[PDB]
Amino acid sequence: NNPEYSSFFGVMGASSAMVFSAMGAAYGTAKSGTGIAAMSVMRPELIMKSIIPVVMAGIIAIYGLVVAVLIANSLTDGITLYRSFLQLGAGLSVGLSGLAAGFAIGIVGDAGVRGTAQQPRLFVGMILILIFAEVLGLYGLIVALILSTK
Amino acid sequence: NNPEYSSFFGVMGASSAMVFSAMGAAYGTAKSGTGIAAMSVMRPELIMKSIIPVVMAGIIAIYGLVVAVLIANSLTDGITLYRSFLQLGAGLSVGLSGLAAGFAIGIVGDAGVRGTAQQPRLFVGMILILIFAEVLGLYGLIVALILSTK
């Protein structure tokens, strides 16, 4: 039979998939929020546009949630140790890729929101950079799914 | 008959392959991001041309993802301990080489994007340095593949 403690690892996968992602997202949002405040003192009109980074941070959380729920639905009492390891690896990958993407989105959003208050032409550039950061989390999600479904 | 824990290292490889590289990419996409913003206030026309470092960092992430998927496809319930160690080593190599390459790309891209506002002739120089940093990640990927497909 399989060890009784196998599910442990899988469970942590799920939790990690939601925890680190959330942390990442938090950071992102946090920094973006700060920037928006500093941006709004002088350019209120760009208040709604400069919320784009926050959204791009929030999406990262969603990634984690997806994987977490996915893992939370693939757990079973007699989950083979190999499957539990797969789910733990998927959770760690998605969570920490989302954390890295949250760091990147937070820094980029802060800098680009502050800059766009002074140079409107930078806005498009900012978006591009944000995308190039967000995809990082997406990459993790992909790997997580490849590990989770397998 | 193989140990039940053998798969563990395997998944770690994959997870690491997508985490550390992602982290590296994030740093890149973060640092260059800031630099680009700091440049945009004065020389907006250099925005697009200055997105190159970010792209480089993005490519680093791709490397990670690729190797991760490789490992995430080479995992099997009876994966031998030798193959599991090989996959863990490939993941470590790609992830940490991508991390170092992403840090180098971030630093060089920030510095060069800030400089190119002042001295346009630096652009090409910066590009070369970025390539010299980018190749580092490539090297990791190469070794990873050699270890992963061995």
Next chain:
Amino acid sequence: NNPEYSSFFGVMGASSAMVFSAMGAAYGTAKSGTGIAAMSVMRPELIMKSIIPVVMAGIIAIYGLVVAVLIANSLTDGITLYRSFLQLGAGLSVGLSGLAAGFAIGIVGDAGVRGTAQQPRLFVGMILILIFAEVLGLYGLIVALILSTK
């Protein structure tokens, strides 16, 4: 007799050889890059002549890649713990010697490229010092080979 875990160290050799060397090279490519970006604002003509530190850091990375591949192409399934220890030692020697050489090349190349903007006669001086740093990595490579090809 040839334990199931004997390969692990050998794998941790290859990864090390590729990881630490890359890190060193990254540092050499990062620090030097900043210096060039700082120097090229006032002395554009020296930008291409001053990429030598980046090339030397890349050569450190190439040493790392050479040893990492030379190890990864010698990891048989039943690798004796003695041979795996030899490969781990070779990987550690090459990787950490390359890391130290990358630190030295970073510091020396950045200082030299920034000073050469002031006193051109320092250029040759810098090169000599860089060589004295580069050989350090080479020394590691030598030892690595002597261990890996034993």
Next chain:
Amino acid sequence: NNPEYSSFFGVMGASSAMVFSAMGAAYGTAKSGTGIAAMSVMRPELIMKSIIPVVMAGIIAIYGLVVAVLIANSLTDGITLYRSFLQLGAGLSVGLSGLAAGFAIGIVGDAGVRGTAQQPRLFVGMILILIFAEVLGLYGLIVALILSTK
């Protein structure tokens, strides 16, 4: 007869002899290099005279290499625990002695290059100190030659 892990320690010794010595040398080649870059702006003619510290740092690395080779050529498959730990002791001796000697050479050379820039009479004085620092590493090497051939 002998444990299958007996060859680990000796191997590490060899690697240590290469690694730490290199680190020592690297630090020297860094610090002195920085000092030279600071000196050479005002006194270019002293670059060649002031390159002595770097050379001495290089010498330290050579010592490590020697010991490393001396241990890397003596590692046999049936290496007993006695010989293994003798080689480990030799490696630790040479590596840490070279590390300390490289730190001393780097600091003393970084001070003395600038001092000789200011006061020429200090040149010989600087040398009279550097050699002392250098032989510290030598002392380690000596003990290594006593140990690895006990």
Next chain:
Amino acid sequence: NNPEYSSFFGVMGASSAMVFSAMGAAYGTAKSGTGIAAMSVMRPELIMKSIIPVVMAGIIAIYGLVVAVLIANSLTDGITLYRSFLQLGAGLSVGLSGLAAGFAIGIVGDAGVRGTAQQPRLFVGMILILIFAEVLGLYGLIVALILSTK
């Protein structure tokens, strides 16, 4: 019929009682020391009067010594694990109570000797506070004795 390692803890009582107390006393004798020096330049006539803190700190050391000697005279080869634990508890109690009392005495004595140079009336106040700090060490001694003479 008792473990031969039973005396260990008892010894670590004695040792501790004399070590920690000493450390505490040292701190006192250190801090107050500095204070006296700092205040001796302008008000030499208060040097002997302002030596009370050091004396109090000295007394703390004596406390530890007493307990230590007591424990060092209660040790025996066949000391039961229970008596050994009692002696370890007494040693830790006296040592760390004296350490806290020494910290308090050092801080209070430094502050008081510095203030009394400016406010003579503070002297008595300082003494009172010092007494309180001293009492802390005394408490430890009491407990130590209760533990060390059961």
Next chain:
Amino acid sequence: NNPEYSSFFGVMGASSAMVFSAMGAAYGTAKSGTGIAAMSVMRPELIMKSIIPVVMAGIIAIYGLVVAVLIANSLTDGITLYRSFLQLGAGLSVGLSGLAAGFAIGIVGDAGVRGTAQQPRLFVGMILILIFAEVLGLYGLIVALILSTK
């Protein structure tokens, strides 16, 4: 007979007695010397008197030595675990009491030497405080002897 490993704790006792007492004496001498040298430029005629703290610090080393010698003379390969623990406790007590006394002597000697440079009347006061710190080391010695002879 006794255990094979019994002599370990006695060996560590001797090593601690010497090492920590040497640490204390070295710190006391270094601090006092760096205070004395800096004072001497202002008050060159005081050096000799100001050498008193250094001597006191030196005495701490002697204490360690004394106890160390005892433990190194009463330590055979077949001593009971009880005597080995006694020697370990004596060594730790003397070593750490000497360490604390050396720190206190360094601090007090430096401060008092500078004050005497600024206020001759402080000299005697300093001596008193130094004695109060020196006695701490003596206390340790006493306890150490009581433990080592028992």
Next chain:
Amino acid sequence: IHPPVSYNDTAPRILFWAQNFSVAYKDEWKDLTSLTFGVENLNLTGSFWNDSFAMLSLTYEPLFGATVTFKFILASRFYPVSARYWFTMERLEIHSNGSVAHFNVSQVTGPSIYSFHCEYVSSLSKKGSLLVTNVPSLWQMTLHNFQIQAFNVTGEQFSYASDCAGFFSPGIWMGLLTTLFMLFIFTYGLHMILSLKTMDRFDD
């Protein structure tokens, strides 16, 4: 789950269980688990139980064309460095035709109040090699999941089971200490290297 072999002297004294029990002569292997655990006619004669010395003799009649007898010899005594009685399976003794083959047992020890469990108490190098010899022997043995309790045996239940499988082993301990010293040295070196700083200005 086959029941343990339980020698009785007014009560269970030596309990011996093994998920597998195989023995080989001249490289000819044979399985004895079915013939050992659960058989009610086991030829346990020759066993003994001192207060501080136990001998479990399992004999098989037609094995390898002779009556073979495996005697596991354990002894528990008071160790002064503690107050505990520690039992160790001192050795194994295979009696074939008028002949005896001795195996040393390396790491079968533990408090006499606790049984001892160990995966692969076998003479094969690939399987721990707890049964060792310096005189080459024609016999090989493999006890897979070997759990034995000779002293303080109460009832049919094995007491808590100390086992050879530890967190650390002498080789692991030596390697960890060596790596710890070298990590201290490397951390010192890297801390000093990372403190390197470059000048931010150059003389006019």
Next chain:
Amino acid sequence: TGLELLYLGIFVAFWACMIVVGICYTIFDLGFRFDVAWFLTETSPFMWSNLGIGLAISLSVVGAAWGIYITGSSIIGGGVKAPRIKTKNLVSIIFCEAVAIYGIIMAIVISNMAEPFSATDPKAIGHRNYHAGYSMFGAGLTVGLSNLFCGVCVGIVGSGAALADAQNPSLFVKILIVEIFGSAIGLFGVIVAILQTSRVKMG
């Protein structure tokens, strides 16, 4: 203080783990698994002896280099305006280097006490061999750390004496005394090491 933060985190985590592990072992009646005897005994005496020799030499060299650079920076900074220092204050450097010398000597005096066993069973290795290993390790620790502290102390005092010499020539001759005191500690360590390995005999 990022690296300091990393070191503090590792230290705190390790010692919290140690506290909890000791509590668990003691309370769950699993103390018999915490065989310190097994650790000290199975661990080969060769490890202890060779770590002892390596430390005896390496820590002495580390102290010598620490003192040498501590005092050489000051010597070469002061000598810019008073070059005479370079001539007179080399004695300080000498003292620092002397430390290293003791190191190698003790290394020799320790390395001469090594000898293989041809045994692996602790009863076979024996009290003599185990005590030889432990005492060689302890002597290495004593000499190495005493030399480290003595070298650092002599370097600090030498830097002070070189800074004092740059301003008044007639002070070094009276400050060298401190260095002499600071040097004695080194000797003390050596003596103790010689006393620790006086009756050590592997084989």
Next chain:
Amino acid sequence: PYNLAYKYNLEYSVVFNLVLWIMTGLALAVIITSYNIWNMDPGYDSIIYRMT
């Protein structure tokens, strides 16, 4: 039944140490990287004094 011991694998030391130290190293690497990114220079020092 019979209170049989848990069937610990004879290689428990090896796998325990492998996993413990591999995961400790990976956790340390992740923590160090996340600290180097979190404590990254904000990069808008050219804008700190304009917003404040």
